[PDB]
C-alpha cells in the first residue's frame, strides 16, 4: 500500500484482503446465524403452538 | 412521539453532525489563533521598522 | 553521545496497525477517518 513511483496511490492488496478477512471474522456474522436460527426456532415454536 | 422516537434519533444524528462541525470549528479556532498571532507578528515588525 | 534504543518492532507493529485500521470506521463522522488516511 501507498503511492506508486509511477504516481498511483494504491491501497495494497494485502490490507484489502486483511479487511475482507476482518469481515469474514466479524461481518461474517456467525452470531447473526445464531440469532437467525433463534428466530427460526421462535417462529417455529409459535407456529407449532398455532398447529396444536 | 413514538414517531418522535425515530425523529429524536434523527435529532441525535444531527447533534452528532453538529458535534463534528463544532470540533472542526475548534480546529479552525486554533488555526485562526496561530494565524492571527502570525499576523500580529507581521504588524509588530512593521511597527518596529516604522518607529 | 549515547545511542538509545529505537524499537522498530514497535514501529513496524504500529505501521501494520495503522494500515490495518485505516479503512475501518464507516459511521458518519468520517473526517476523522480522512485524517487517519492522512496519517
Automatic annotation (TrEMBL), chain C:
<protein>
    <recommendedName>
        <fullName>Alpha-xenorhabdolysin family binary toxin subunit B</fullName>
    </recommendedName>
</protein>
Amino acid at each position: 500500500g501507498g503511492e506508486l513511483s509511477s504516481g498511483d496511490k494504491v491501497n495494497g492488496l494485502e490490507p484489502q484482503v486483511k479487511t475482507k478477512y476482518d469481515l469474514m471474522e466479524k461481518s461474517n456474522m456467525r452470531k447473526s446465524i445464531k440469532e437467525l436460527d433463534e428466530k427460526i426456532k421462535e417462529k417455529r415454536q409459535r407456529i407449532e403452538q398455532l398447529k396444536k | 412521539v413514538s414517531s418522535q422516537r425515530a425523529l429524536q434519533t434523527a435529532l441525535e444524528a444531527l447533534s452528532l453532525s453538529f458535534s463534528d462541525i463544532g470540533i472542526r470549528m475548534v480546529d479552525a479556532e486554533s488555526a485562526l489563533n496561530h494565524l492571527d498571532f502570525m499576523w500580529l507578528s507581521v504588524l509588530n515588525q512593521i511597527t518596529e521598522s516604522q518607529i | 553521545l549515547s545511542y538509545p534504543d529505537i524499537n522498530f518492532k514497535i514501529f513496524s507493529q504500529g505501521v501494520k496497525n495503522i494500515s490495518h485500521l485505516a479503512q475501518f470506521k464507516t459511521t458518519g463522522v468520517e473526517v476523522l477517518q480522512e485524517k487517519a488516511l492522512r496519517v
